[PDB]
Amino acid sequence: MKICKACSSCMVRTYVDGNIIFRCSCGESVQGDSQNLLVSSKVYHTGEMEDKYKIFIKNAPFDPTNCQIKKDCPNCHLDYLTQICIGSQKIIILVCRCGYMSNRG
Amino acid sequence: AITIEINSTKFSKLRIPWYLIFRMFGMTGDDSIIEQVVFDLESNSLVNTFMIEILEKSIHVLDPIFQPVQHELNREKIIQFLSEKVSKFVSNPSAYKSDENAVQYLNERQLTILDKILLPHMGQTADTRVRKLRFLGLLIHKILLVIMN
Amino acid sequence: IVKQMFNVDITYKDQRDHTEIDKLRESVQIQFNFTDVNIERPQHRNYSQGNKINLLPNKARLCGLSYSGPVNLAAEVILTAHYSNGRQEVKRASIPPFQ
Amino acid sequence: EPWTFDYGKIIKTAKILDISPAVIEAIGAMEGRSYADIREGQGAPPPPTSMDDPRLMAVDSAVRIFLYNYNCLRHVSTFNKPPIHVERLVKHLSYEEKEDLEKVLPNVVNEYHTTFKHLRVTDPASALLYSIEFLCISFLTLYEIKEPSWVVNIVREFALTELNTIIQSEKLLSKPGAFNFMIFGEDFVC
Numbered sequence: 001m002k003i004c005k006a007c008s009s010c011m012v013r014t015y016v017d018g019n020i021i022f023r024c025s026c027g028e029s030v031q032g033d034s035q036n037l038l039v040s041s042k043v044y045h046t047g048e049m050e051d052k053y054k055i056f057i058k059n060a061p062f063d064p065t066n067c068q069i070k071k072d073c074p075n076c077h078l079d080y081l082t083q084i085c086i087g088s089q090k091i092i093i094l095v096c097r098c099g100y101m102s103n104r105g
Numbered sequence: 106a107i108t109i110e111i112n113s114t115k116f117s118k119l120r121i122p123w124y125l126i127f128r129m130f131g132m133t134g135d136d137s138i139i140e141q142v143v144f145d146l147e148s149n150s151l152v153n154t155f156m157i158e159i160l161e162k163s164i165h166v167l168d169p170i171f172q173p174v175q176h177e178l179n180r181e182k183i184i185q186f187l188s189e190k191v192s193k194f195v196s197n198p199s200a201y202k203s204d205e206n207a208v209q210y211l212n213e214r215q216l217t218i219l220d221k222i223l224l225p226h227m228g229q230t231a232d233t234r235v236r237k238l239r240f241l242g243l244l245i246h247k248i249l250l251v252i253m254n
Numbered sequence: 255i256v257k258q259m260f261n262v263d264i265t266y267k268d269q270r271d272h273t274e275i276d277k278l279r280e281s282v283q284i285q286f287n288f289t290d291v292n293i294e295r296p297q298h299r300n301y302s303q304g305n306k307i308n309l310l311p312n313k314a315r316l317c318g319l320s321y322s323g324p325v326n327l328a329a330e331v332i333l334t335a336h337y338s339n340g341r342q343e344v345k346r347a348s349i350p351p352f353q
Numbered sequence: 354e355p356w357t358f359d360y361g362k363i364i365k366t367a368k369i370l371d372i373s374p375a376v377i378e379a380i381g382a383m384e385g386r387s388y389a390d391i392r393e394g395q396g397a398p399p400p401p402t403s404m405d406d407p408r409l410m411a412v413d414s415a416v417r418i419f420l421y422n423y424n425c426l427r428h429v430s431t432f433n434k435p436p437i438h439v440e441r442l443v444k445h446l447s448y449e450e451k452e453d454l455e456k457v458l459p460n461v462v463n464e465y466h467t468t469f470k471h472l473r474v475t476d477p478a479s480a481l482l483y484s485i486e487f488l489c490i491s492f493l494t495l496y497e498i499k500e501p502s503w504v505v506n507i508v509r510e511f512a513l514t515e516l517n518t519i520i521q522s523e524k525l526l527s528k529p530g531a532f533n534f535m536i537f538g539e540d541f542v543c
């Protein structure tokens with residue numbers, strides 16, 4: 001959103017002149033072309049995106065309740081890896097405390 | 106609209122617009138109020154965009170009960186309006202306004218009530234108003250996180 | 255709960271005006287808290303006019319009595335009168351322990 | 354650009370508005386204090402030591418309401434029904450004069466918001482002092498307007514009324530004096 005420079009307030013959009021005219025309750029107008037041509041946004045596969053599990057995938061190697069498999073880590077050569085299965089497509093991600101991640105994630 | 110209803114011994118069953126709670130404690134800037142929910146107003150992200158659209162829409166939604174103080178940027182007027190809408194004994198809304206001491210008494214009573222029944226686990230004095238606002242923003246952030254699935 | 259959550263500070267309108275000060279007075283503020291709270295062991299009276307004796311649970315079960323212990327409260331009352339001149343009169347009284 | 358606190362601006366503003374200098378510095382710190390003690394500097398809380406101090410938000414809100422009402426004054430032509438606090442100062446002005454108000458009146462916002470946020474996350478006491486000094490500087494700038502003459506009275510009266518309303522609002526959160534508790538029509542008051 002556009003924050004009014006005088007009073008820290010959100011300003012309406014009110015497309016009138018063929019472009020965006022940001023109007024505030026204090027009367028200030030900013031014009032403001034280019035950067036704010038995006039009016040509406042909606043991501044339809046939320047709950048399965050990368051940033052949904054980013055913290056969990058980062059913390060997965062240190063979680064003692066996560067499944068481990070007898071697979072060698074290509075980075076630090078530990079004999080085991082943490083195995084994750086996220087999403088409705090059952091994406092398998094192998095992670096290690098050294099920071100290795102199985103390509104995806 | 107994102108409405109916050111506080112049910113306590115002092116008062117209950119009153120849905121206040123969320124930004125009015127932040128405004129009553131001195132946080133009147135919309136950017137600072139929204140920053141309490143998104144934690145960063147200048148981060149592109151994906152949750153931040155969705156949350157910012159919801160909060161911007163919720164700020165401008167017209168409320169039937171809090172209509173006069175919706176666009177008020179002075180916290181004293183919002184505190185007075187809440188005091189009038191909350192206090193049981195204020196059955197005459199105009200007589201007391203002439204007396205300045207009456208207005209001060211209502212404001213002090215409302216501020217004490219708010220410090221006692223708004224997130225009392227985070228503090229019950231006037232030193233923790235901003236911390237309470239941070240916690241409330243965190244709660245709204247979690248709710249909006251659940252909202253986007 | 256009694257000593258912290260049950261403090262009273264209520265101002266009531268003065269209802270009497272058959273005196274010059276009575277017309278002067280328009281409100282009195284009642285303010286009291288509780289200072290000592292203690293619950294004793296269940297007791298009972300035999301003679302109906304005698305000393306309270308210990309009530310054993312079997313007697314309470316047989317007689318349909320309540321296995322309940324006395325609650326003793328000690329309070330401090332502060333009464334403040336208000337007049338139409340900006341002054342106030344304070345009468346401070348301490349309530350002795352009572353059941 | 355470096356900033357340093359200037360108590361002379363607060364002294365001057367107190368002289369203009371006839372209030373004591375301690376009243377201005379008590380903005381946002383008048384809660385739980387009688388106005389008699391506030392104007393005499395009695396019981397003044399120590400300067401803030403954390404960003405979570407409500408005094409910072411209170412003084413920022415005071416500066417914000419000042420700037421909001423100033424912008425409302427500078428854009429009367431936009432509002433079909435201008436706000437009451439601004440309406441009474443433009444009844445004797447023409448549409449051409451109202452439209453000229455946008456360019457004649459200076460912009461006093463400057464870089465207040467970014468500097469305040471930086472100080473709040475860096476130095477809370479400096480943030481509070483900066484907010485109070487900025488409010489005083491903005492009031493003095495609006496008060497010391499000499500050209501054009503047809504706007505000097507308007508800007509002077511607006512600045513006086515705005516800062517008086519701000520102080521009264523901060524005063525309306527102070528300790529009340531003795532009064533009739535039955536002014537609210539009801540048998541009881543709690």
Ligand SMILES: [Zn+2]
Binds near residue numbers: 005009
């Ligand atoms: Zn604005």
Ligand SMILES: [Zn+2]
Binds near residue numbers: 073076077096099100
């Ligand atoms: Zn590894």
